[model samples]
Target: TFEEFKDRLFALAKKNGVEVQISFLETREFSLRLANGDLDQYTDAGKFNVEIKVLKDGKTGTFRTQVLENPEKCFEEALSNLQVKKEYFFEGGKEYREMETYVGRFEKLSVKEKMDMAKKAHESAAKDERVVMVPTVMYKDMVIKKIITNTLGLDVESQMDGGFLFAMAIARDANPRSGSWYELARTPEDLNPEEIGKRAAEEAISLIGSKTIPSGKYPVLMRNTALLDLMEMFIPMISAENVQKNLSPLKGKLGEQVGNPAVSIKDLPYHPKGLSSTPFDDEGVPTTEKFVLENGVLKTFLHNLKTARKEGVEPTGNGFVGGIRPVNLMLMPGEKSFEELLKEMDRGVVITEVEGMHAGANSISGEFSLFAKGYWVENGEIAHGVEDITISGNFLDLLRKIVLVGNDVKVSQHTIAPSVLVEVLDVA
Candidate 1:
């Protein structure tokens, strides 16, 4: 059915004397949430979408649809709002690399088996006497199939399957506190329900007596999960288009040291742990690994076809949704462990979480001031949980001041890094 759909669209585009690219994506997902050993929500559904782009006279128009009964009408609609900047499309015949794309392990389990996972996690969290409530345990499994074709003989496809679990618990003292843990993997077997539940309870209990520290500058050990969110907010700074438009701070900074020598970051399109891994990017360019930063040197900025053309460089296979972006942006791990990083900090705040990312962080300015939670570390040990505090700094300065990068790298969606120790930041 999909092949026929592509063929008909290709013929129509050819008859109109235009080049076209078509992307069809289908996703099947199942989701469930449990509260107090009872199912609060459940859903299993599948959806598909098709996007078409038609190019003519140095301009391109695009349209998206869910129902594909007619190509003629779709073609006309795609030509409605053409922009005349002379866009480029893949000419085809580029060799797309073969790699492991699908592991069907998550789909093998029955409904009953999947439900048992949530029950186990719920029981584990409830076992803690201090836990006032096991608010919610959530699970999700999904498989995605994508196909890209164009009139210029380009054809490619990819499939991926993954599952994730989330558990959260609440504890009460003079104040109520919450803790959460998450795990994601290609197979359902890798999801540790008991571990997630136990850690959630431990984390919640640990924060029961948290209080604000005095306002001042302090050395900071940012946990891996906390850093992951900041890295995501920092992603657009490396975009070539943003640089070209003078919107990125990284503009004109290539090949220079921008951070600590121990810090390196990469855009990987085919790593096992990556959620967005693929053989090719949205523009049909064959995807490959590239380092945006290597050992603190600004190696490169991410590029798509248009930006690459403007920069007079090869396209970096980062095109997505007609713009430049990384498939999997990761901070490279270092030799020291989390404990080693803690020892290096000696005395500081270990910031485990930050809130209001969108409102507090600035991608262009590289500045942030956000409410945060974590613990105070004294003499290489956690002294007490901390709350009602704010951490303020420039992200660039944070990277530059990184004294040590830990070996405890963990994946959280598209942006990932390990725990890192910063020399100092304003904590109040």
Candidate 2:
């Protein structure tokens, strides 16, 4: 497959006398579920996509098309499309060398066992009253076979195992709140159905008879449950894309203190259990672990080929897809637990969840006002369950206001963050 795709792409580029890079990726995805003794959703499929990069007339153009149909035509279309575009300076030459081959253990799991697990989780959820809907009981496993070759001497082959099992349960009622939990690891042994089920059930029970609180300025403590999603929206603002575009607050602020002295953040790709761990990046560049923020000081911006060229800095092996995505976002955990953090807060709101992050937060200005859930705390005690409240604060100010970080560093499929407690957030 790699030879066929590579030959076609290389021939096209050579025929046009333009430099070209091609990446061939083969992926197989599997999903399964059984709810109330009936099949919900099940699929097993294998697919491939050809990504082409053509540098012609000093301009580079990228095109992606599935390899199922006539891929030769797709490659021709990509080359034809590139002829009209003006080129920018391209720095990613043949930088690849041989990498250590990785053969993952996840492929050993039998399809029968995978289906049985999904069935068990669904049956368990069906037995519970609070679990009105079991939307997801899926086991997705894909073996990513990547071959990247360019006009330079670089030719590389990499195999990676990616799999996850996520389950969500929703309660039946007017409010109809839902809670989801997932287990993502290199192997099937990492999943814990009982624990995931317990969390969903507890959320459903707790959500009964929910009410909203009036809007007011108050201190807010964000739990780990939804903090990662907020980080997804906020973290990119610190990237070189936003910075170079004059949209990031961290623009031109290298080595300056940007957050509280106690707050430290790292882009840790080599963490033991990090889902994003890989020896090399999308551009076949070697990756390394780095501290993005050390003791509140802005270290550097994450860069791809384009961004690195624009910033005149070395490509830090952070490139992926179109830009840099966080590997293991490790925020240094404080000594306090959630309860201890709450006890010390003189008065605040403990927000367990937030909504409308995409529409609410302004990535350019670092401004945020989110719809929140949790409890109003008065003198370090929960006044009551609070809802319909808006927590408003600038991300920069909130970072500086972080008075406590919980000892329980909740690790999930995406983030590893402790419950962050901050003061002086407007909650209404």
Candidate 3:
């Protein structure tokens, strides 16, 4: 199927004296959920989509369609829809590395066995006296296949597979408290439903009487998920397009101190277990590992083919569908673990969640003020869960404030992060 349409488009582009690139993306996904000890939702789906890009008269245009009839018409539409012009093209004969992401481990698990894990998590969570309700336990997995071809005889194919399990529990004493937890792995066998259930229950039961503490600035330790959420908001600032357009705070800050000495960030395009790992970017450019920030200094920004040529620097293989984005971004971890951070902070706030990325967080400005929830630490231990609190700070300031990093790294989507201890944050 890939070769059929690829040949059609290539032939049509040559006759029209234009350049063409075809990207075929196919997805296989399955999900199951349980509610009230009953299977409530399930989905198994396979989808195929195609994107055709044509360079006409020194400008590029793109058209996406599922209809396979008349690829010649698709080619004409791609070129005719050009309202913008960008002189970008992919040259042939680039080397690519082999990857080992798709093992079909999740596919081997029987459907009944997969459903059993959700029931196990649901049963364990509902059995807890403190947890009044186990709302839902969900299992989801996805396998994506991609094929790329251009008129220049550049051909490549890749597939990636990953999945996650989720559980949410509700408890009540003073008021209702909810806790949700998840597990991510390349295979289904690694997910432990019992452990997932127990953690969800513990989190809900522990926060039975959460309340706001006094307003002041204090040392803040953000857990892995909490930091990853904030990190996603800050990731767009490193795009060279954004930097050149004056939309990034990192503009003109290259080779300067942007974070604390303890902070380091990297974009690993080929992380072995990363969900977004890939050998090539959207523009068919061979991706490479790069350090965006190292030891507090801004090293480089993400670039695509066009931006790299404009800057006279090499591309970092970050070109994605809409703009320049990292495949697998990571904040390098330190040797100290989470327990060590607790001992290090002694008396501080451990933020577990934040709630306002769309409203209070601005990636371009590196500023955020969000409603938050977490625990109050006293004498090197968690004392109580604090709620109805708000934390306000610039992400750049938080970067500069970082004093310690934890070794507990966790991957969520395309981001990997660890617990970070910032010297101070305003809380109310």
Candidate 4:
């Protein structure tokens, strides 16, 4: 069907004197959810979507369809939408270097085995006395295969597979608190459900009597996950598109110091454990691991073909269908461990979570006011769990204030970083 669709699409394009490109995606997902020792939900699904880009008279049009029943109709729809001038023209496919693609062991697991894993996670979390409820324990795996082809002779294919186990624990004592932990790996054996459950239970139990410190500025240690949240807000500032639009604070700051010397950031598209690792980008451009920031200096901005062209530079392979985006944003780790980082701060707060980011963060302006949860450290020890405090600061200012970065690095679906220490920030 793809070949037939391609033949028809190209033929139509030639007849209409237009250039065309197509991005085809095929996905398979398998999931299992257990609640109260029972299998609550199970799903195994697959789907396909195709996006067509037609360039005619220097204008580009796009059309997407899940049903490939009528190729002519799809082509006509795409052609009819051509009204805006094409800012970026699609070049022919280039040779992409071969890269190793990780395969998950999820395919080897039987339905019963998956259910057993979910049950084990739930039972492990429920074992804790403080854990009053284990509302959800889930095991999920996904496989994605994408192929980008164009009339310009580009045919690229890539596949990725991974699975994760998640457990949530609700604990109660003086006050109820909830915590969740999840583990991901290419294989089920590598993902420890028991560890995830225990950590979830312990995290919840630790927050039993959460308190807040007096209003004042204090040193802050942002955990890896919390740092990931904060970094996500500022990541867009590194996009060349944003810089071109004058919406990024990093605009006109190239080659200058944008953060502390302790801070370094890179876009690692070839990271072995990265879920989104790819050898080529959506535009059929070969991808290479590159640094966006190096020891406080702004090295380069993330760019697509259009942005790179406008800047008279090579494309950074960050072009996605929507715009330029990172495949994997990693903050280089420091020598100190999480414990060492805490010890280095005699009096400070360890922020484990931040809420209201979307509502409180202004990515363009780089300012944020967030409700935070963590532990207060006094004299190199955690005095008590802290909560209900609002931390306000500018993201750029926070970057410059970083004093330490922990060696305990973690890789999530998109972001990777370690715990980061800031000299001081407003907390109330």
Number of colliding residue pairs in each model: 0, 7, 0, 0
**Which is the leading candidate under TM-score?**
1
- What lDDT does each candidate get? 0.86, 0.70, 0.86, 0.84
In model 4, which runs have C-alpha deviations exceeding 4 angstroms?
Answer: 34-42, 102-104
What's the CA RMSD for each of the models? Answer: 1.7, 3.8, 1.8, 2.0
Residue range 1-428, candidate 2, lDDT tens digits = 56676776677777878777777788777777655446677888898877887777667677787753454676666667765532332334434334333346657878887877666666655557866877766667777787666775457667767567666677776767665666666666777666666565565556666667666666777887757656665567767877887878878788988878878888765544455666567776666667777888888788776788777888777677856766567777889888888888857778787788889888788898888667777778766566466777788887788767787776655467788887767877
Candidate 4 lDDT over residue span 1-428, tens digit each: 88889889989888888888888998888998877557778899999999988877667889999876688888988888885433555566566657665575788788888887888888889998878998888889888888887776777889888888999888996777878888777767788878888888888888888886798899999999788777888678988999999889999898998899999999987665567778778887877688888998999998898889888998888887676788889999999988888889988998887889989899899999998878889888888888678899999999999988899988777788999999999998
Worst 10 residues of 4 by lDDT: 84-93
Put down candidate 3 lDDT per residue, 197-252, tens digits, no spaces: 88888888888888779999999999987898889876789989988898888888
Q: How big is the RMSD of model 4?
A: 2.0
Candidate with the larger TM-score of 2 and 4: 4
Expressed as tens digits, the lDDT of each residue in 1-428 for candidate 1 is 66777888888888889988899989999989998668989999999999989988768899899987788788888878585344888778888768776899878889888888888888888888899999899998999998888888888889998888888899887888888888878887788899989988888999988887899999999999889888876688998889888888888899989989988999888667666778898888998788788888999988888888888999888888746888888899989999988888899999988888989999889989998879999999998888788899999999898878988988888887899999999998
For model 3, the stretches where C-alpha displacement exceeds 4 angstroms are 82-85
Report how far residue 162 has shifted in candidate 1, in Å. 0.3
Query: Ranking under lDDT, best-scoring first?
Result: 1, 3, 4, 2
Residue 304 local lDDT, model 3: 92
